[model samples]
Target: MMKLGLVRFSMLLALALVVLAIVVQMAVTMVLHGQVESIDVIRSIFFGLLITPWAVYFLSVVVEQLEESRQRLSR
Candidate 1:
Protein backbone atom coordinates (compact mmCIF):
# COMPACT_ATOMS: atom_id res chain seq x y z
CA MET A 1 0.00 0.00 0.00
CA MET A 2 2.81 2.38 0.76
CA LYS A 3 4.39 1.81 -2.62
CA LEU A 4 1.11 2.46 -4.33
CA GLY A 5 0.61 5.55 -2.21
CA LEU A 6 4.09 6.74 -3.08
CA VAL A 7 3.28 6.49 -6.78
CA ARG A 8 0.15 8.52 -6.26
CA PHE A 9 2.00 11.09 -4.18
CA SER A 10 4.68 11.48 -6.83
CA MET A 11 2.06 12.07 -9.52
CA LEU A 12 0.30 14.66 -7.41
CA LEU A 13 3.62 16.31 -6.66
CA ALA A 14 4.51 16.34 -10.35
CA LEU A 15 1.21 17.96 -11.27
CA ALA A 16 1.63 20.58 -8.57
CA LEU A 17 5.05 21.49 -9.86
CA VAL A 18 3.65 21.81 -13.38
CA VAL A 19 0.91 24.09 -12.09
CA LEU A 20 3.43 26.23 -10.27
CA ALA A 21 5.67 26.41 -13.30
CA ILE A 22 2.76 27.47 -15.50
CA VAL A 23 1.66 30.15 -13.05
CA VAL A 24 5.16 31.48 -12.64
CA GLN A 25 5.73 31.48 -16.39
CA MET A 26 2.46 33.31 -16.87
CA ALA A 27 3.33 35.94 -14.30
CA VAL A 28 6.72 36.57 -15.86
CA THR A 29 5.24 36.75 -19.33
CA MET A 30 2.56 39.09 -18.06
CA VAL A 31 5.15 41.37 -16.52
CA LEU A 32 7.28 41.36 -19.64
CA HIS A 33 4.61 41.60 -22.33
CA GLY A 34 1.28 42.17 -20.60
CA GLN A 35 -0.06 38.80 -21.80
CA VAL A 36 0.25 35.06 -21.17
CA GLU A 37 1.50 32.93 -24.05
CA SER A 38 -0.29 29.77 -25.04
CA ILE A 39 2.90 28.23 -26.39
CA ASP A 40 4.56 28.20 -23.02
CA VAL A 41 1.44 26.69 -21.50
CA ILE A 42 1.46 23.90 -24.06
CA ARG A 43 5.15 23.32 -23.57
CA SER A 44 4.77 23.12 -19.82
CA ILE A 45 1.89 20.70 -20.03
CA PHE A 46 3.74 18.55 -22.53
CA PHE A 47 6.82 18.17 -20.38
CA GLY A 48 4.74 17.71 -17.22
CA LEU A 49 2.90 14.79 -18.72
CA LEU A 50 6.06 13.45 -20.27
CA ILE A 51 7.74 13.12 -16.91
CA THR A 52 4.86 11.36 -15.17
CA PRO A 53 5.89 7.85 -16.22
CA TRP A 54 9.50 8.48 -15.32
CA ALA A 55 8.53 9.86 -11.93
CA VAL A 56 6.16 7.01 -11.21
CA TYR A 57 8.58 4.28 -12.22
CA PHE A 58 11.45 5.79 -10.27
CA LEU A 59 9.41 6.18 -7.08
CA SER A 60 7.86 2.75 -7.45
CA VAL A 61 11.23 1.09 -7.80
CA VAL A 62 12.71 2.94 -4.86
CA VAL A 63 9.73 2.25 -2.62
CA GLU A 64 9.70 -1.40 -3.58
CA GLN A 65 13.41 -1.66 -2.88
CA LEU A 66 12.96 -0.03 0.52
CA GLU A 67 10.13 -2.36 1.45
CA GLU A 68 12.15 -5.35 0.35
CA SER A 69 14.97 -4.24 2.61
CA ARG A 70 12.57 -3.80 5.51
CA GLN A 71 11.13 -7.26 4.93
CA ARG A 72 14.58 -8.77 5.03
CA LEU A 73 15.29 -7.03 8.31
CA SER A 74 12.04 -8.31 9.80
CA ARG A 75 13.08 -11.89 9.05
Candidate 2:
Protein backbone atom coordinates (compact mmCIF):
# COMPACT_ATOMS: atom_id res chain seq x y z
CA MET A 1 0.00 0.00 0.00
CA MET A 2 1.15 3.51 -0.80
CA LYS A 3 1.30 5.84 2.15
CA LEU A 4 -1.13 8.71 1.54
CA GLY A 5 0.91 10.97 3.79
CA LEU A 6 3.92 10.56 1.56
CA VAL A 7 1.92 11.73 -1.44
CA ARG A 8 0.56 14.66 0.54
CA PHE A 9 4.01 15.77 1.64
CA SER A 10 5.34 15.39 -1.88
CA MET A 11 2.52 17.55 -3.22
CA LEU A 12 3.15 20.21 -0.59
CA LEU A 13 6.86 20.23 -1.27
CA ALA A 14 6.34 20.47 -5.03
CA LEU A 15 3.84 23.28 -4.74
CA ALA A 16 6.00 25.23 -2.30
CA LEU A 17 9.02 25.00 -4.57
CA VAL A 18 7.01 26.28 -7.55
CA VAL A 19 5.55 29.14 -5.56
CA LEU A 20 8.94 30.07 -4.12
CA ALA A 21 10.47 30.30 -7.55
CA ILE A 22 7.60 32.40 -8.85
CA VAL A 23 7.81 34.73 -5.86
CA VAL A 24 11.56 35.14 -6.16
CA GLN A 25 11.38 35.85 -9.85
CA MET A 26 8.63 38.39 -9.40
CA ALA A 27 10.55 40.10 -6.62
CA VAL A 28 13.69 40.35 -8.69
CA THR A 29 11.78 41.72 -11.65
CA MET A 30 10.03 44.33 -9.54
CA VAL A 31 13.24 45.41 -7.82
CA LEU A 32 15.34 45.72 -10.93
CA HIS A 33 12.71 46.89 -13.42
CA GLY A 34 10.52 48.97 -11.09
CA GLN A 35 7.19 47.55 -12.31
CA VAL A 36 5.57 44.14 -12.43
CA GLU A 37 2.66 43.29 -14.64
CA SER A 38 -0.45 42.11 -12.88
CA ILE A 39 -1.42 39.69 -15.62
CA ASP A 40 1.98 38.03 -15.63
CA VAL A 41 1.77 37.48 -11.90
CA ILE A 42 -1.74 36.16 -12.26
CA ARG A 43 -0.72 33.88 -15.09
CA SER A 44 2.25 32.55 -13.19
CA ILE A 45 0.13 31.85 -10.16
CA PHE A 46 -2.53 30.25 -12.32
CA PHE A 47 -0.03 28.07 -14.10
CA GLY A 48 1.52 26.87 -10.88
CA LEU A 49 -1.83 26.02 -9.36
CA LEU A 50 -2.82 24.33 -12.58
CA ILE A 51 0.25 22.16 -12.99
CA THR A 52 1.05 21.01 -9.46
CA PRO A 53 -1.89 18.73 -8.82
CA TRP A 54 -1.86 17.20 -12.30
CA ALA A 55 1.81 16.31 -12.03
CA VAL A 56 1.45 15.01 -8.49
CA TYR A 57 -1.59 12.94 -9.30
CA PHE A 58 0.05 11.47 -12.37
CA LEU A 59 3.06 10.34 -10.36
CA SER A 60 0.99 9.01 -7.50
CA VAL A 61 -1.17 6.96 -9.82
CA VAL A 62 1.83 5.60 -11.66
CA VAL A 63 3.56 4.64 -8.44
CA GLU A 64 0.52 2.82 -7.15
CA GLN A 65 0.12 0.96 -10.41
CA LEU A 66 3.76 -0.03 -10.44
CA GLU A 67 3.52 -1.30 -6.90
CA GLU A 68 0.48 -3.38 -7.75
CA SER A 69 2.09 -4.71 -10.91
CA ARG A 70 5.25 -5.70 -9.08
CA GLN A 71 3.31 -7.65 -6.47
CA ARG A 72 1.24 -9.48 -9.05
CA LEU A 73 4.21 -10.29 -11.22
CA SER A 74 6.14 -11.67 -8.30
CA ARG A 75 3.34 -14.08 -7.53
Candidate 3:
Protein backbone atom coordinates (compact mmCIF):
# COMPACT_ATOMS: atom_id res chain seq x y z
CA MET A 1 0.00 0.00 0.00
CA MET A 2 2.84 2.40 0.69
CA LYS A 3 4.44 1.59 -2.61
CA LEU A 4 1.13 2.09 -4.37
CA GLY A 5 0.77 5.46 -2.75
CA LEU A 6 4.25 6.46 -3.87
CA VAL A 7 3.49 5.44 -7.43
CA ARG A 8 0.27 7.40 -7.45
CA PHE A 9 2.01 10.46 -6.09
CA SER A 10 4.69 10.29 -8.77
CA MET A 11 2.14 9.86 -11.51
CA LEU A 12 0.12 12.79 -10.30
CA LEU A 13 3.21 14.99 -10.18
CA ALA A 14 4.12 14.05 -13.72
CA LEU A 15 0.60 14.80 -14.92
CA ALA A 16 0.63 18.17 -13.24
CA LEU A 17 3.94 19.02 -14.87
CA VAL A 18 2.59 18.02 -18.25
CA VAL A 19 -0.39 20.29 -17.80
CA LEU A 20 1.93 23.12 -16.79
CA ALA A 21 4.02 22.58 -19.90
CA ILE A 22 0.91 22.77 -22.06
CA VAL A 23 -0.01 26.06 -20.47
CA VAL A 24 3.44 27.42 -21.13
CA GLN A 25 3.32 26.26 -24.72
CA MET A 26 0.02 28.00 -25.25
CA ALA A 27 1.38 31.21 -23.84
CA VAL A 28 4.48 31.03 -26.00
CA THR A 29 2.49 30.30 -29.11
CA MET A 30 0.29 33.28 -28.53
CA VAL A 31 3.26 35.55 -28.02
CA LEU A 32 5.31 34.24 -30.94
CA HIS A 33 2.45 34.42 -33.37
CA GLY A 34 1.81 38.06 -32.51
CA GLN A 35 -1.72 37.26 -31.40
CA VAL A 36 -1.56 39.34 -28.28
CA GLU A 37 -5.06 40.66 -28.38
CA SER A 38 -8.07 40.54 -26.15
CA ILE A 39 -9.18 37.23 -27.59
CA ASP A 40 -5.78 35.74 -26.98
CA VAL A 41 -5.90 36.74 -23.37
CA ILE A 42 -9.37 35.33 -23.11
CA ARG A 43 -8.30 32.09 -24.73
CA SER A 44 -5.31 31.78 -22.45
CA ILE A 45 -7.47 32.46 -19.43
CA PHE A 46 -10.02 29.96 -20.65
CA PHE A 47 -7.44 27.25 -21.13
CA GLY A 48 -5.89 27.99 -17.76
CA LEU A 49 -9.27 27.88 -16.04
CA LEU A 50 -10.13 24.65 -17.79
CA ILE A 51 -6.91 22.99 -16.71
CA THR A 52 -7.05 24.41 -13.20
CA PRO A 53 -9.77 22.12 -11.92
CA TRP A 54 -7.97 18.98 -13.00
CA ALA A 55 -4.70 20.30 -11.60
CA VAL A 56 -6.35 20.95 -8.28
CA TYR A 57 -7.89 17.51 -8.28
CA PHE A 58 -4.58 15.83 -9.01
CA LEU A 59 -2.85 17.93 -6.37
CA SER A 60 -5.39 16.78 -3.84
CA VAL A 61 -4.87 13.19 -4.89
CA VAL A 62 -1.13 13.58 -4.42
CA VAL A 63 -1.61 15.08 -0.99
CA GLU A 64 -3.99 12.31 0.03
CA GLN A 65 -1.58 9.66 -1.14
CA LEU A 66 1.23 11.24 0.80
CA GLU A 67 -0.91 11.27 3.91
CA GLU A 68 -1.83 7.66 3.42
CA SER A 69 1.79 6.66 2.99
CA ARG A 70 2.72 8.53 6.12
CA GLN A 71 0.01 6.79 8.09
CA ARG A 72 1.07 3.41 6.79
CA LEU A 73 4.67 4.05 7.69
CA SER A 74 3.67 5.13 11.17
CA ARG A 75 2.16 1.73 11.67
Candidate 4:
Protein backbone atom coordinates (compact mmCIF):
# COMPACT_ATOMS: atom_id res chain seq x y z
CA MET A 1 0.00 0.00 0.00
CA MET A 2 2.82 2.37 0.81
CA LYS A 3 4.51 1.53 -2.48
CA LEU A 4 1.30 2.04 -4.39
CA GLY A 5 0.80 5.46 -2.90
CA LEU A 6 4.36 6.39 -3.69
CA VAL A 7 3.93 5.28 -7.30
CA ARG A 8 0.75 7.28 -7.70
CA PHE A 9 2.29 10.36 -6.20
CA SER A 10 5.33 10.06 -8.40
CA MET A 11 3.20 9.71 -11.54
CA LEU A 12 1.16 12.77 -10.63
CA LEU A 13 4.26 14.77 -9.86
CA ALA A 14 5.84 13.79 -13.17
CA LEU A 15 2.82 14.86 -15.15
CA ALA A 16 2.67 18.13 -13.28
CA LEU A 17 6.29 18.69 -14.13
CA VAL A 18 5.55 18.09 -17.81
CA VAL A 19 2.73 20.64 -17.72
CA LEU A 20 5.04 23.11 -16.05
CA ALA A 21 7.60 22.56 -18.77
CA ILE A 22 5.04 23.33 -21.42
CA VAL A 23 4.13 26.58 -19.68
CA VAL A 24 7.75 27.55 -19.31
CA GLN A 25 8.39 26.86 -22.96
CA MET A 26 5.51 29.04 -23.98
CA ALA A 27 6.66 31.82 -21.70
CA VAL A 28 10.19 31.63 -23.07
CA THR A 29 8.96 31.74 -26.64
CA MET A 30 6.86 34.79 -25.94
CA VAL A 31 9.66 36.53 -24.11
CA LEU A 32 12.18 35.91 -26.86
CA HIS A 33 9.81 36.73 -29.69
CA GLY A 34 8.28 39.75 -27.94
CA GLN A 35 4.54 40.17 -27.38
CA VAL A 36 4.13 43.59 -28.96
CA GLU A 37 1.69 42.28 -31.52
CA SER A 38 -1.65 40.74 -30.54
CA ILE A 39 -1.23 38.08 -33.19
CA ASP A 40 1.83 36.65 -31.44
CA VAL A 41 0.02 36.33 -28.15
CA ILE A 42 -3.02 34.91 -29.89
CA ARG A 43 -0.94 32.34 -31.69
CA SER A 44 0.71 31.12 -28.52
CA ILE A 45 -2.61 31.07 -26.69
CA PHE A 46 -4.24 29.19 -29.55
CA PHE A 47 -1.59 26.53 -29.53
CA GLY A 48 -1.77 26.21 -25.76
CA LEU A 49 -5.53 25.76 -25.90
CA LEU A 50 -5.17 23.10 -28.57
CA ILE A 51 -2.61 21.10 -26.63
CA THR A 52 -4.20 21.47 -23.20
CA PRO A 53 -7.11 19.08 -23.81
CA TRP A 54 -4.79 16.21 -24.68
CA ALA A 55 -2.68 16.91 -21.66
CA VAL A 56 -5.70 16.96 -19.42
CA TYR A 57 -6.96 13.70 -20.89
CA PHE A 58 -3.60 12.00 -20.35
CA LEU A 59 -3.31 13.23 -16.78
CA SER A 60 -6.85 12.16 -16.03
CA VAL A 61 -6.13 8.66 -17.34
CA VAL A 62 -3.02 8.41 -15.20
CA VAL A 63 -4.91 9.45 -12.09
CA GLU A 64 -7.82 7.13 -12.86
CA GLN A 65 -5.53 4.17 -13.39
CA LEU A 66 -3.69 4.93 -10.21
CA GLU A 67 -6.96 5.02 -8.28
CA GLU A 68 -8.10 1.75 -9.84
CA SER A 69 -4.84 0.05 -8.98
CA ARG A 70 -4.95 1.31 -5.41
CA GLN A 71 -8.51 0.06 -5.01
CA ARG A 72 -7.58 -3.42 -6.24
CA LEU A 73 -4.60 -3.53 -3.95
CA SER A 74 -6.68 -2.47 -1.00
CA ARG A 75 -9.14 -5.27 -1.69
Candidate 5:
Protein backbone atom coordinates (compact mmCIF):
# COMPACT_ATOMS: atom_id res chain seq x y z
CA MET A 1 0.00 0.00 0.00
CA MET A 2 0.95 3.63 -0.36
CA LYS A 3 2.83 5.00 2.59
CA LEU A 4 0.52 6.75 5.01
CA GLY A 5 2.49 9.76 6.18
CA LEU A 6 2.02 11.67 9.38
CA VAL A 7 0.24 14.59 7.75
CA ARG A 8 -2.25 12.37 5.97
CA PHE A 9 -2.63 10.08 8.98
CA SER A 10 -3.26 13.00 11.28
CA MET A 11 -5.90 14.34 8.93
CA LEU A 12 -7.55 10.92 8.73
CA LEU A 13 -7.35 10.53 12.46
CA ALA A 14 -9.08 13.85 13.04
CA LEU A 15 -11.76 12.99 10.57
CA ALA A 16 -12.38 9.58 12.13
CA LEU A 17 -12.53 11.02 15.63
CA VAL A 18 -14.97 13.70 14.62
CA VAL A 19 -17.27 11.17 13.07
CA LEU A 20 -16.80 8.73 15.93
CA ALA A 21 -17.60 11.45 18.45
CA ILE A 22 -20.78 12.38 16.68
CA VAL A 23 -21.93 8.79 16.44
CA VAL A 24 -21.07 8.01 20.01
CA GLN A 25 -22.68 11.19 21.28
CA MET A 26 -25.88 10.45 19.47
CA ALA A 27 -25.95 6.88 20.70
CA VAL A 28 -25.29 7.91 24.25
CA THR A 29 -28.07 10.42 24.06
CA MET A 30 -30.48 7.97 22.56
CA VAL A 31 -29.65 5.19 24.99
CA LEU A 32 -29.46 7.18 28.19
CA HIS A 33 -31.98 9.92 27.61
CA GLY A 34 -34.14 8.23 24.95
CA GLN A 35 -33.83 11.37 22.85
CA VAL A 36 -31.44 14.15 22.05
CA GLU A 37 -30.75 16.62 24.84
CA SER A 38 -27.82 18.88 25.50
CA ILE A 39 -27.25 17.48 28.96
CA ASP A 40 -26.58 13.92 27.82
CA VAL A 41 -25.50 14.70 24.29
CA ILE A 42 -22.72 16.96 25.47
CA ARG A 43 -20.95 14.38 27.59
CA SER A 44 -20.16 11.61 25.11
CA ILE A 45 -18.50 13.86 22.55
CA PHE A 46 -16.52 15.50 25.31
CA PHE A 47 -15.62 12.10 26.66
CA GLY A 48 -14.71 10.85 23.23
CA LEU A 49 -12.49 13.84 22.59
CA LEU A 50 -10.93 13.40 25.99
CA ILE A 51 -9.97 9.82 25.19
CA THR A 52 -8.51 10.41 21.72
CA PRO A 53 -4.89 9.85 22.63
CA TRP A 54 -5.75 6.33 23.72
CA ALA A 55 -7.27 5.67 20.35
CA VAL A 56 -4.23 7.14 18.67
CA TYR A 57 -2.03 4.77 20.60
CA PHE A 58 -4.25 1.80 19.86
CA LEU A 59 -4.49 2.71 16.20
CA SER A 60 -0.72 2.89 15.93
CA VAL A 61 -0.34 -0.55 17.44
CA VAL A 62 -2.86 -1.92 14.98
CA VAL A 63 -1.10 -0.41 11.99
CA GLU A 64 2.27 -1.61 13.21
CA GLN A 65 1.01 -5.17 13.60
CA LEU A 66 -0.62 -5.17 10.17
CA GLU A 67 2.54 -3.99 8.46
CA GLU A 68 4.64 -6.48 10.33
CA SER A 69 2.34 -9.31 9.41
CA ARG A 70 2.30 -8.29 5.75
CA GLN A 71 6.07 -8.24 5.55
CA ARG A 72 6.47 -11.46 7.46
CA LEU A 73 4.10 -13.42 5.23
CA SER A 74 5.79 -12.34 1.99
CA ARG A 75 9.14 -13.80 3.00
Candidate 6:
Protein backbone atom coordinates (compact mmCIF):
# COMPACT_ATOMS: atom_id res chain seq x y z
CA MET A 1 0.00 0.00 0.00
CA MET A 2 3.01 2.29 -0.14
CA LYS A 3 3.84 4.47 -3.13
CA LEU A 4 7.23 2.84 -3.89
CA GLY A 5 7.76 5.27 -6.75
CA LEU A 6 11.27 6.23 -7.88
CA VAL A 7 11.25 8.71 -5.01
CA ARG A 8 8.82 7.12 -2.56
CA PHE A 9 10.49 3.74 -2.93
CA SER A 10 13.81 5.02 -1.69
CA MET A 11 12.15 6.25 1.48
CA LEU A 12 10.51 2.89 1.96
CA LEU A 13 13.77 1.03 1.37
CA ALA A 14 15.89 3.24 3.61
CA LEU A 15 13.36 2.88 6.40
CA ALA A 16 13.25 -0.86 5.93
CA LEU A 17 17.03 -1.02 6.05
CA VAL A 18 17.18 0.80 9.37
CA VAL A 19 14.40 -1.26 10.91
CA LEU A 20 16.12 -4.46 9.84
CA ALA A 21 19.45 -3.24 11.10
CA ILE A 22 18.03 -2.48 14.53
CA VAL A 23 16.25 -5.81 14.88
CA VAL A 24 19.32 -7.68 13.70
CA GLN A 25 21.62 -5.76 15.99
CA MET A 26 19.32 -6.22 18.97
CA ALA A 27 18.98 -9.90 18.26
CA VAL A 28 22.74 -10.35 18.10
CA THR A 29 23.07 -8.45 21.38
CA MET A 30 20.33 -10.43 23.08
CA VAL A 31 21.99 -13.61 21.88
CA LEU A 32 25.41 -12.62 23.08
CA HIS A 33 24.43 -11.07 26.43
CA GLY A 34 21.61 -13.62 26.93
CA GLN A 35 19.22 -10.77 27.79
CA VAL A 36 18.91 -7.02 28.20
CA GLU A 37 17.79 -5.15 31.31
CA SER A 38 15.86 -2.61 29.19
CA ILE A 39 16.20 0.10 31.96
CA ASP A 40 13.29 1.71 30.06
CA VAL A 41 15.88 3.56 27.94
CA ILE A 42 14.85 1.78 24.76
CA ARG A 43 14.58 3.85 21.59
CA SER A 44 14.95 3.67 17.83
CA ILE A 45 17.21 6.10 15.91
CA PHE A 46 15.58 5.64 12.49
CA PHE A 47 13.31 8.67 12.86
CA GLY A 48 16.16 10.97 13.79
CA LEU A 49 17.99 9.55 10.79
CA LEU A 50 15.49 9.20 7.98
CA ILE A 51 12.82 11.81 8.74
CA THR A 52 13.91 13.88 5.76
CA PRO A 53 14.55 10.78 3.58
CA TRP A 54 16.73 10.23 0.50
CA ALA A 55 13.65 10.18 -1.72
CA VAL A 56 13.03 13.81 -0.89
CA TYR A 57 16.72 14.29 -1.50
CA PHE A 58 16.43 12.96 -5.02
CA LEU A 59 13.33 15.05 -5.56
CA SER A 60 15.30 18.07 -4.45
CA VAL A 61 17.96 17.33 -7.03
CA VAL A 62 15.31 17.09 -9.73
CA VAL A 63 13.90 20.43 -8.64
CA GLU A 64 17.36 21.91 -8.85
CA GLN A 65 17.77 20.68 -12.41
CA LEU A 66 14.36 22.04 -13.37
CA GLU A 67 15.25 25.38 -11.90
CA GLU A 68 18.53 25.40 -13.76
CA SER A 69 16.71 24.70 -17.00
CA ARG A 70 14.25 27.51 -16.30
CA GLN A 71 17.08 29.90 -15.63
CA ARG A 72 18.81 28.99 -18.90
CA LEU A 73 15.55 29.43 -20.82
CA SER A 74 15.24 32.98 -19.46
CA ARG A 75 18.58 33.94 -21.02
The prediction achieving the highest lDDT against the true structure is 3
- Give the clashing pairs for model 6: none
Each candidate's TM vs. the true structure?
0.34, 0.31, 0.33, 0.33, 0.35, 0.32
lDDT for model 3, on a 0 to 1 scale?
0.57
What would the per-residue lDDT of candidate 3 be over residues 1-75, giving only the tens digit for each residue? 444345543444446656887799789787788755654456655767756777776545554544423532331
Report, for every candidate in turn, its global Cα lDDT versus the true structure: 0.53, 0.52, 0.57, 0.56, 0.51, 0.46
Clash pairs, model 2 backbone: none
Model 1 Cα lDDT, one tens digit per residue, 1-75 = 444224433334445555777899779777777354564446665878857886776545455444322321111
Score residue 12 of candidate 1 by CA lDDT.
43
Runs of candidate 3 exceeding 4 Å displacement: 1-10, 34-75
- Best-to-worst order by TM-score is 5, 1, 3, 4, 6, 2
In candidate 5, what are the lDDT values of residues 1-75, reduced to their tens digit?
Answer: 522333243434445655886799779767776545474437766868746886776456444433312321111
Candidate 2 lDDT over residue span 1-75, tens digit each: 543323343434445555876799779777777555563546665877857876776555445433312321111
Clash count per candidate: 0, 0, 0, 0, 0, 0
Model 4: how far residue 34 lies from native, Å: 7.7
**Best-first order by lDDT:** 3, 4, 1, 2, 5, 6
Q: Pick the candidate with the highest TM-score.
A: 5
Clashing pairs in 4: none
Candidate 3 scores a C-alpha RMSD against the true structure in Å of 8.9
* TM-score result, candidate 6: 0.32
Q: After superposition, which runs of candidate 6 have C-alpha atoms over 4 Å from their true positions?
A: 1-10, 34-75
Q: Which lDDT tens digits does candidate 6 get at residues 48-73?
A: 55546655664444333323123111
Model 5 off-target regions past 4 Å? Answer: 1-10, 34-37, 40-75
**Lowest summed lDDT over 10 consecutive residues: which window, candidate 5?**
66-75
RMSD to the hidden true structure, all candidates = 8.6, 8.6, 8.9, 8.4, 7.4, 11.0
